[PDB]
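Archive entry. Fields below.
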Amino acid sequence: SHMSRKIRDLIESKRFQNVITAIIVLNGAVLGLLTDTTLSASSQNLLERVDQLCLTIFIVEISLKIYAYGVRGFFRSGWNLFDFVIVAIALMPAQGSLSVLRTFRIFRVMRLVSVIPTMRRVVQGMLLALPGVGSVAALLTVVFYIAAVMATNLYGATFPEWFGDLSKSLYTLFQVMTLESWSMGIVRPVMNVHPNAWVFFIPFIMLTTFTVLNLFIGIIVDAMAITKEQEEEAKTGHHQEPISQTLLHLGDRLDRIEKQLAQNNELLQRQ
Amino acid sequence: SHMSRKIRDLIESKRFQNVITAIIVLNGAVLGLLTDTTLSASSQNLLERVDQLCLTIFIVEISLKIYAYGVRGFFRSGWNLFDFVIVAIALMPAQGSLSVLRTFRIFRVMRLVSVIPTMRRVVQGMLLALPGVGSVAALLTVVFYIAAVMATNLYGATFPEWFGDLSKSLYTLFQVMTLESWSMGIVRPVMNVHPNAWVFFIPFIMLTTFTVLNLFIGIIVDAMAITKEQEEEAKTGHHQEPISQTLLHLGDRLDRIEKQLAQNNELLQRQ
Amino acid sequence: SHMSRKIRDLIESKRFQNVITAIIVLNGAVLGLLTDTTLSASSQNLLERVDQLCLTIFIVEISLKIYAYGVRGFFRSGWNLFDFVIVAIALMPAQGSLSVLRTFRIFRVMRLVSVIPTMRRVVQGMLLALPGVGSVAALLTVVFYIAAVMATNLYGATFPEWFGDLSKSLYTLFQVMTLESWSMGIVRPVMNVHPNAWVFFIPFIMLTTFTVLNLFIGIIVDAMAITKEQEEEAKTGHHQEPISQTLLHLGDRLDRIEKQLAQNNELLQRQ
Amino acid sequence: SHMSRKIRDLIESKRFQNVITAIIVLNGAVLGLLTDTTLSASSQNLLERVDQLCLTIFIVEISLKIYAYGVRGFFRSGWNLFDFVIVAIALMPAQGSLSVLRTFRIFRVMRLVSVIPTMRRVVQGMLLALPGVGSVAALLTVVFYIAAVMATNLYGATFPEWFGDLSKSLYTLFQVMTLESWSMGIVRPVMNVHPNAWVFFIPFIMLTTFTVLNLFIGIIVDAMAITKEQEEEAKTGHHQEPISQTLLHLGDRLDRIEKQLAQNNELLQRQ
Ligand SMILES: CC/C(=C(\c1ccc(O)cc1)c1ccc(OCCN(C)C)cc1)c1ccccc1
Ligand SMILES: CC/C(=C(\c1ccc(O)cc1)c1ccc(OCCN(C)C)cc1)c1ccccc1
Ligand SMILES: CC/C(=C(\c1ccc(O)cc1)c1ccc(OCCN(C)C)cc1)c1ccccc1
Ligand SMILES: CC/C(=C(\c1ccc(O)cc1)c1ccc(OCCN(C)C)cc1)c1ccccc1
Ligand SMILES: CC/C(=C(\c1ccc(O)cc1)c1ccc(OCCN(C)C)cc1)c1ccccc1
Ligand SMILES: CC/C(=C(\c1ccc(O)cc1)c1ccc(OCCN(C)C)cc1)c1ccccc1
Ligand SMILES: CC/C(=C(\c1ccc(O)cc1)c1ccc(OCCN(C)C)cc1)c1ccccc1
Ligand SMILES: CC/C(=C(\c1ccc(O)cc1)c1ccc(OCCN(C)C)cc1)c1ccccc1
Ligand SMILES: CCCCCCCCCC(=O)N(CCO)C[C@@H](O)[C@@H](O)[C@@H](O)[C@@H](O)CO
Ligand SMILES: CCCCCCCCCC(=O)N(CCO)C[C@@H](O)[C@@H](O)[C@@H](O)[C@@H](O)CO
Ligand SMILES: CCCCCCCCCC(=O)N(CCO)C[C@@H](O)[C@@H](O)[C@@H](O)[C@@H](O)CO
Ligand SMILES: CCCCCCCCCC(=O)N(CCO)C[C@@H](O)[C@@H](O)[C@@H](O)[C@@H](O)CO
Ligand code: NA
Ligand code: NA
Ligand code: NA
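PREDICTED_STRUCTURE:
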């Protein structure tokens, strides 16, 4: 239709992208000003109305996108669904979830990631890298669970604040893995009651700092490669062979050309 | 035999793998519930029986594997031997080892690594990467030993809690390497008695944080390459030339093709 | 002109570079001696005159460069503009800027980077790598802003020293990201009032340490590649195809040569 | 000569290498036992004689090497000179150096690095990687010097324990860079007197943690490549083109073969 065509042209324009970006920045700025308790009643009401105006602009934005692209076409993108969920949750009356309150309107600033394409590409690369590290993340989970059960049984009765139950142990083991007061704060006091506690905590530190770094490097390397390959696919329109596949078959390809070259030499020498 | 053939088909099936996985998860869950001291006598007896049921299911599992594959064939795999050692140690009466107690039944959760193939491949890659870093791990050991002897002689008499003997010094040097209260907790108090102690501790920190990162990066890079190469070997059935070998001979291979190409050009120009 | 030609030859000489380097080192040494409060009035006046002599040598240096290369030619280089700004700011009477004082004459030691070419190349590579990580740096900024607004609203009234306003929260969140007393100093005291505060702080730590490492690795890898490629461009005089571009088209290039090779074989077999 | 030939064969043998290794291990073990103050007078005299026996075995070892290889040939290797310096310093009466005492006989354990070839190769790779990072190490030195001068002038009078002079400031800035109590221990107390001190310390942390990681990654990547290339050179006897040189010319080489291939196709189509 003619109506949907001119709306899509407006939506896809750089100025529309800039308008939405400016309103996200403004909404973030007013929410940051609203953290200040010393403000007057009128100053607070003024910022609250600017928050309402920002929200209504986003409702118009999303509605234009659903009309212009269609319900199936809009919800086809995970980025648009994210944008829809962020805006539509603000107008949701009494939600049945295990949450304290929906006071976190500042999560609307996270739309800068979805609206700005350079930021969208960076986050996309990271998200695409996550399934590939699932096994490493599960190994860390297994180590934490085993260690938390052991720490609860070994030290729960003598150090109940740090290890009195499974929740307490998982928390202090996270603290131990981050190396935060692990010795002066946790393990030297524990060793005053349990002298060989270093046998538990030093291998736990060695294994978890290793695994976390492995997980992080795994995500970083993959995200960087995925992003680089997606940019090339976007530039040329052709499918990009992943680098690992190029490196794995590099030897196979070179020797095959060496063979085809030597047989062409064989056909050449005798003519 | 017909009996061993249908048992191997059952063992190798995805449902059998899922049954074993569910029982490991269940056993881990009941052991985690057993860390809670507030439970009733009957609640504890109930979970203890679920632990017994889980163990008996693993005894059947392993026995089916020894019968179906043979004693030589089963113990041919390091993964099956690990599975055997984890389950068989629970039925071992009075073991002669330098251990406090075999209360750590939670180590059974480590079977999730051996049973889940994606997790098995990740750990396998890491294990295969370890011999290759042996020299770096030995260099760190040498630095720790030298430093612990020096720290004991220099500071043992004035700081006996931290350096009074070799064990105490190795422990606080591990703490110093992890950067945990190294200055406010250890070196500023030491410098009040020994003003030039920074000459010992700052180079020790520089060398050990460097070496640890070197060891960790070495393992991560190798494990990632080993895993990638093993997957390709499993997919195609052909031996995968290691990437380092492809990169080392890349120059040699390209110039050899350049030479074979130029001589084919030489045979072509004059005919 | 003959005057500008002999001045440029003098400027470009290794001895002129060594003279300037020696004066920067000397100026840095006298400023370091001037930090000592126990010095006599005459000792202080003596060093202050050596600081004046060093500054006057730099005024001559820069003036020779503007005359020899021309106003347009000198200010064409970002390195020369930096050198000009560092020296010319010392002779600036009453500047209108949001600064306490221009006592930081020690920033003149930063000229060692611009004057020594090996150091200039290293910093240049790093600077050229910065625009490419802009999106990651902006993602970290967004996470810090969102988290600081949340932390101010959640914990400002009960923990005003750490979260009483946006500035206070950004500061303690930076401290939390660096893992400095995050648990014993900040989150365990906060959890005594807000028991589920770990839900906020543990994901904040996981996301920001990850993003910072991503930003740092991104800069390091790019700077290393940019430097390596610029050296090759300087050595040969030919434009260096970036490594990513060589790796992305490696597969495309190899199969194209395989195809050209097979058709040459096809023309050869039938003659 | 016949005497030097049979001595070199003995020196180069695996058993001779194993004898020397065993004596280094033994010497290290006795020095570690000598750190214990509770030992008897006779127990101490016994270990001291085993230290003397170990030293005399090393004097024989080195003397056999100088005779068998020649003064010029032995001192041609940096590894042999290191071995000579470590052993010969023990027999040096009254040395004129800025040292407290030559009690550090435990540095003899560092010979495990020189005697064991796998360990020698690892350290060699690291040492060869150091000149290449000289510029990054100098940039960190410049940042530390500038920051130490600034910190001394800004905070020396109000925080003299941490910044009272240049030495004190360099020490606490090293502590700040390692993130050790940087905020709770140093910067929050400083900000109580100087509210904008975060403007100095947060950029200092960002720049130095970045530079240190850059220096460390630079050494790790280079050492790994140098080692891999030296092994290949040792295996084949042929000079190994560095990987960076192979990667820089990969594009140049591939297009040159594409060109030589297309002209061979041109000579083929028309015959
Ligand atoms: C092609 C990108 C890619 C991987 C990749 C990216 C960059 C790179 O340098 C190398 C590979 C990839 C492939 C396999 C992989 O395996 C890890 C094990 N998983 C299955 C638990 C991880 C990433 C991938 C990611 C998710 C699903 C499928 C493929
Ligand atoms: C040696 C090149 C390499 C990989 C590689 C090895 C052989 C091969 O034929 C192709 C590539 C590499 C790159 C990515 C990779 O991703 C898997 C990530 N996991 C942790 C999810 C694995 C190996 C690599 C490893 C670690 C960091 C950076 C690069
Ligand atoms: C082929 C895999 C491999 C190595 C490798 C893997 C990935 C990669 O990118 C490069 C190499 C390997 C080879 C040599 C090596 O030497 C270190 C020194 N050791 C002997 C102390 C380490 C790993 C290896 C591992 C153990 C034994 C033999 C070979
Ligand atoms: C530059 C590519 C490279 C290596 C390489 C260099 C030259 C060559 O011809 C082939 C590969 C590299 C990769 C692995 C490696 O493993 C040894 C691990 N040690 C620490 C056990 C060494 C170099 C590399 C080095 C560090 C991290 C990631 C990659
Ligand atoms: C050619 C160097 C380069 C990049 C590069 C360097 C080394 C390397 O191994 C790979 C690439 C480069 C290219 C793209 C890039 O994208 C990140 C996203 N930005 C746009 C936010 C970053 C660096 C680059 C840097 C700035 C502008 C343009 C190009
Ligand atoms: C796997 C090789 C690789 C990159 C690569 C992947 C595919 C390809 O065709 C070419 C190169 C790589 C290198 C640099 C890079 O820079 C982007 C930096 N961002 C974070 C600004 C991206 C990928 C890489 C990734 C992480 C660390 C080191 C190397
Ligand atoms: C060939 C090894 C090498 C370098 C290298 C090693 C591995 C790798 O992946 C890439 C290069 C090398 C080359 C240049 C370099 O420049 C840094 C700047 N210096 C001059 C301050 C560093 C290392 C080198 C080291 C010292 C002197 C000369 C060359
Ligand atoms: C992208 C491949 C690469 C380098 C590279 C880029 C282009 C090229 O043609 C060849 C190689 C790389 C490798 C080593 C290197 O060493 C310099 C070390 N400095 C810090 C002393 C520089 C770039 C690299 C960069 C960082 C980590 C691992 C690998
Ligand atoms: C991948 C690792 C993931 C670690 C996840 C940790 C979650 C456990 C934290 C939690 O749910 N708590 C109950 C919340 O009610 C525990 C904390 O409250 C407790 O540990 C202490 O902070 C003190 O309150 C008691 O000393
Ligand atoms: C690669 C690095 C590996 C470091 C290994 C450290 C092991 C040494 C620990 C040990 O065996 N102890 C004896 C156990 O009885 C020492 C601890 O007990 C002691 O250091 C303190 O914690 C206090 O108890 C005394 O102040
Ligand atoms: C990318 C992350 C960037 C973080 C940037 C932090 C800047 C905020 C610091 C600031 O401007 N302050 C006001 C300066 O007047 C705050 C500090 O003063 C305050 O947080 C405390 O240090 C105490 O003074 C109060 O308890
Ligand atoms: C690349 C970074 C290199 C940092 C190098 C630091 C060397 C400076 C240490 C030094 O020489 N001191 C004098 C030694 O006499 C200083 C210490 O003594 C002093 O800072 C404190 O520890 C206290 O003694 C006073 O509060
Ligand atoms: Na740390
Ligand atoms: Na810390
Ligand atoms: Na820390």
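CURATOR_NOTE: The pocket of hega-10 (ligand 11) is lined by residues C 144, 161, 167-168, 170-171, 174; D 188, 191, 195-196, 198, 202 (CB under 6 Å).
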